[PDB]
């Protein structure tokens, strides 16, 4: 018997989402990037519904809800990719039907970024990150996104406390062998934030270059 928040978060996990790359269209960076952006777009739609399932989130004002999502969507997407890539080696599982190896990365111009994301994967691998910890870290990442536009700081901190508490309690009961596992999990957040920032900046140097824009 362990944490109810954690079990609930496991139950609230979105069903698999597919990239669905178009076979008819020949491989090319514009293709890969176009595919990754459509996938992300569809995942973002899902993240909004998913967020309603987070204990303590729906009680925030709509403005604060949007501010948190706006600041943490990339961290949430990246964590997902990372968790799906744990049983793999030097490959990123953006989706079951879209797994990127080194060559597919070079061919898309995502070598640097994908290598940075692989660094997150590596750290979580060594720790043997569990699905329970993964879902709790996603919610924590959302609550701890540090938006400068928050209207109700106290309420946001309460969301953080509730999820932080769930993690600490889960670790206390399932990993008594390492009394600092909760802390180690929290210490992975800086790299997540850092990697998300590099991804966002990348998504701009291309949306910008007229890569696959209109935006």
Ligand X SMILES: CC/C(=C(/CC)c1ccc(O)cc1)c1ccc(O)cc1
Query: Which residue ranges make up the site for ligand X (CB under 6 A)?
Result: 33, 36-37, 39-40, 43, 77-78, 80-81, 94, 113, 199, 202-203, 206
Write the CB contacts of 166 (distance below 8 Å, at least 6 apart in sequence): 3, 5, 6, 9, 55, 136
> Applying CB under 8 A, which of residues 66, 174, 191, 203 lies at the interface with a copy of itself?
191
* Options 25-33, 46-54, 102-110, 145-153: segment touching a copy of itself (CB under 8 A): 145-153
Pick 17 or 155: Cβ nearer a copy of itself: 155
Three-class DSSP category at 198: helix
Pick 104 or 194: Cβ nearer a copy of itself: 194
Annotate each residue in 36-75 with x if it binds a copy of itself (CB under 8 A) or - if it does not, as one string.
----------------------------------------
> Applying CB under 8 A, which of residues 194, 202, 207, 211 lies at the interface with a copy of itself?
194
Torsion of the alpha carbons at 49, 55, 60 and 62, rounded to the nearest 10: 0
Q: Which residue has tokens 């996938």?
A: 39
Pick 86 or 172: Cβ nearer a copy of itself: 172
Q: Taking the chain, what is the end-to-end CA distance rounded to the nearest angstrom?
A: 49
- Please state the separation of Cα 204 from the chain's center in Å: 18
Q: What is the residue-wise DSSP string for 75-87?
A: HHHHHHHHHHTTT
């Amino acid at each position: 018997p362990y944490n109810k928040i954690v079990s609930h978060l496991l139950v609230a996990e979105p069903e698999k989402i597919y990239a669905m790359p178009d076979p008819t269209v020949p491989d090319s960076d514009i293709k890969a990037l176009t595919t990754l952006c459509d996938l992300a777009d569809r995942e973002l739609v899902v993240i909004i519904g998913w967020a309603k399932h987070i204990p303590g989130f729906s009680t925030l004002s709509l403005a604060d809800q949007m501010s948190l999502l706006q600041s943490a969507w990339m961290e949430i997407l990246i964590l997902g990719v990372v968790y799906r890539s744990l049983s793999f080696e030097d490959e990123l599982v953006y989706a079951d039907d879209y797994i990127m190896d080194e060559d597919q990365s070079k061919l898309a111009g995502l070598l640097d970024l994908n290598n940075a994301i692989l660094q997150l994967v590596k750290k979580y691998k060594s720790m043997k990150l569990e699905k329970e910890e993964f879902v709790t870290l996603k919610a924590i990442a959302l609550a701890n996104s540090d938006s400068m536009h928050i209207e109700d700081v106290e309420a946001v901190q309460k969301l953080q406390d509730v999820l932080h508490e769930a993690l600490q309690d889960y670790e206390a009961g399932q990993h008594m062998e390492d009394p600092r596992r909760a802390g180690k999990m929290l210490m992975t957040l800086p790299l997540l934030r850092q990697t998300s920032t590099k991804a966002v900046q990348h998504f701009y140097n291309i949306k910008l270059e007229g890569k696959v824009p209109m935006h």
